[PDB]
Design a protein around this ligand. Structure first.
Ligand SMILES: *[C@@H]1O[C@H](CO)[C@@H](O[C@@H]2O[C@H](CO)[C@@H](O[C@@H]3O[C@H](CO[C@H]4O[C@H](CO[C@H]5O[C@H](CO)[C@@H](O)[C@H](O)[C@@H]5O[C@H]5O[C@H](CO)[C@@H](O)[C@H](O)[C@@H]5O)[C@@H](O)[C@H](O[C@H]5O[C@H](CO)[C@@H](O)[C@H](O)[C@@H]5O)[C@@H]4O)[C@@H](O)[C@H](O[C@H]4O[C@H](CO)[C@@H](O)[C@H](O)[C@@H]4O[C@H]4O[C@H](CO)[C@@H](O)[C@H](O)[C@@H]4O[C@H]4O[C@H](CO)[C@@H](O)[C@H](O)[C@@H]4O)[C@@H]3O)[C@H](O)[C@H]2NC(C)=O)[C@H](O)[C@H]1NC(C)=O
Length: 325
C-alpha cells in the first residue's frame, strides 16, 4: 500500500503569538553547534515510495554524517556512518563529511535547505522548503535533557524536491506526494541521557504533529515521558505519556551490544493511545561506538485520538549514548 505523504503550505512560525525562546534562522548556522537532521517521506514520479534519512552531528570528540534509504515496497535498506574531524565556525548552515551533508540555500539559513549524500550505496540530493508550522518542543522550544538544557524545533511537513539514485537510476521526487521532517537540536551539556526513544508521528486525518521523548533523568531521579504536539493555528500541547516497549519482536544490533524492540504502546494523557510497529527489522545506522549508532526506523501505527480511531506513520529513534551499566 501507499502512504498519503504530502506537504503543508503555511508559515514557519505562524502568528508568532507564542513567545518561543529563540529565532529559528539565528539557530541554524554551524557556529551554534549540535545536530541537524532530516527524514524525507518520498513518492517518486513512478509511484515508488521511500524513506530517506540524513544526519550531521558536531561533537567535541568528532563529527559524523550518517544516512539511510528504505524502499517501502521491498524493504531494501542501506545505511552508512562516516566520521569527520571538525565543523567550521561559519555564520551559515553548511555541514559535511566528504561530499555528504546538510546546507541552507537561502539567506535566512532556513527557508530552503538541502540534504545530500554521494555514497556508493546511499546517493541522494533532496531540497525542502520551510512551508510547515514549527514544532517547538516543550512549548517554547527548550526542555531538560540530561544534566542540562536542550533546544529543539521540528519542521514537520516541508515541501520536498530533488532525487534519489537507486541502482544507477536517478529517481525524481514528486513534491505533491512527499514531505520532509527537519529537526534541529543543540545542547547545553555533554551529560545527556544514557539512552532514549524518540517518536516522530504523523496522523493524516488531522493537523497534529507529534514529537515525543522518553528517557530517565538520573540527576533529578525522575522519568521523562512526554509529547509536544503541534496542532492547527500554532496551538501546542505539552502532555505526559506512558511508554511500553514490547520485545515480542526484536532486532539485535550489528555491534552485539544492544537489543531493540520493534513494537510499542503509547498512551498520551488526554489525547489518545497508539500501537506502533517497526516497518521492517533492520533499520540500524551502524557506527564505531554508541553515540554513532542508532535505530532510525520507519513505523506505522493505529490508535484512537479523542475517541476516534486513527492510523498513521512516522519514525522511531532509539539511541544509547553509552553501552555501559
Ligand atoms: C533504556 O535502556 C534500558 C535498558 O536496555 C531499557 O530498560 C529495559 O526495558 C525493558 C522493557 O520494559 C525491561 O525488561 C523487563 O524487565 C523485567 C525485569 O526487570 C527487573 O530486572 C532488570 C534486570 O536486573 C538485572 O540486570 C541489571 C542490569 O542489566 C542489574 O542492574 C540488576 O542488578 C540485575 O542484575 C542481576 O541479574 C543479571 C541477569 O539479568 C546479572 O547479570 C547480574 O549479575 C545480577 O545477578 C532490572 O534492570 C530492572 O530494574 C529496572 O527496572 C525496574 C522497573 O521494571 C526499576 O524498578 C529499576 O529501578 C530499574 O530501572 C528490574 O529489576 C522483566 O520482568 C520484564 O519481563 C516480564 O514482563 C514482560 C512484559 O510484561 C513479559 O513479556 C515477560 O515475559 C515478563 O513477564 C513475566 O514475568 C512477570 C514478572 O514476574 C510476570 O508478571 C508475567 O506474568 C510473566 O510471568 C510468566 O512468564 C515468566 C517467563 O516465562 C515465568 O518465569 C513466570 O513463572 C510466569 O509464567 C521485562 O523483560 C528492562 O528491565 C529494562 N532495563 C532497565 C535497566 O531499566 C529502557 O526501556 C530504555 N529506555 C527507553 C526510553 O528506551
Amino acid at each position: 500500500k501507499k502512504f498519503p505523504f504530502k506537504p503543508e503550505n503555511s508559515k514557519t512560525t505562524g502568528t508568532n503569538a507564542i513567545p518561543i525562546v529563540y529565532g529559528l534562522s539565528e539557530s541554524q548556522p554551524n557556529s551554534v553547534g549540535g545536530s541537524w537532521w532530516s527524514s524525507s517521506y518520498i513518492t517518486t514520479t513512478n509511484n515508488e515510495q521511500y524513506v530517506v534519512l540524513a544526519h550531521y552531528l558536531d561533537n567535541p570528540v568528532y563529527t559524523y554524517f550518517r544516512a539511510s534509504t528504505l524502499n517501502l515496497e521491498t524493504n531494501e535498506y542501506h545505511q552508512y556512518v562516516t566520521v569527520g574531524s571538525s565543523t567550521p565556525n561559519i555564520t551559515t548552515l553548511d555541514v559535511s563529511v566528504g561530499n555528504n551533508g546538510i546546507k541552507s540555500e537561502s539567506e535566512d539559513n532556513l527557508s530552503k535547505l538541502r540534504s545530500y549524500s554521494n555514497h556508493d550505496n546511499v546517493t541522494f540530493d533532496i531540497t525542502y522548503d520551510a512551508t510547515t508550522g514549527a514544532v517547538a518542543n516543550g512549548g517554547a522550544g527548550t526542555f531538560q535533557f540530561g544534566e542540562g538544557l536542550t533546544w529543539e524545533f521540528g519542521l514537520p511537513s516541508a515541501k520536498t524536491e530533488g532525487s534519489l539514485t537507486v541502482h544507477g537510476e536517478k529517481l525524481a521526487i514528486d513534491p505533491a506526494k512527499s514531505h520532509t521532517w527537519y529537526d534541529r537540536q543543540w545542547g547545553n551539556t555533554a551529560a545527556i541521557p544514557s539512552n532514549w526513544t524518540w517518536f516522530q508521528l504523523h496522523i493524516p486525518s488531522t493537523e497534529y504533529k507529534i514529537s515525543a521523548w522518553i528517557f530517565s533523568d538520573p540527576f533529578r531521579n525522575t522519568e521523562t515521558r512526554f509529547a509536544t504536539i503541534r496542532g492547527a493555528n500554532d496551538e501546542t500541547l505539552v502532555l505526559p505519556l506512558e511508554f511500553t516497549p514490547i520485545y515480542k519482536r526484536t532486532y539485535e544490533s550489528a555491534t552485539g551490544r544492544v537489543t531493540y524492540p520493534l513494537d510499542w504502546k503509547l498512551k498520551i494523557s488526554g489525547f489518545g493511545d497508539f500501537k506502533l510497529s517497526s516497518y521492517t527489522e533492520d533499520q540500524e545506522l551502524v557506527g564505531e561506538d554508541a553515540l554513532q549508532t542508532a535505530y532510525e526506523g520507519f513505523i506505522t501505527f493505529s490508535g484512537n485520538v479523542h475517541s476516534k480511531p486513527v492510523q498513521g506513520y512516522g519514525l522511531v529513534e532509539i539511541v544509547y549514548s553509552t553501552w555501559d551499566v
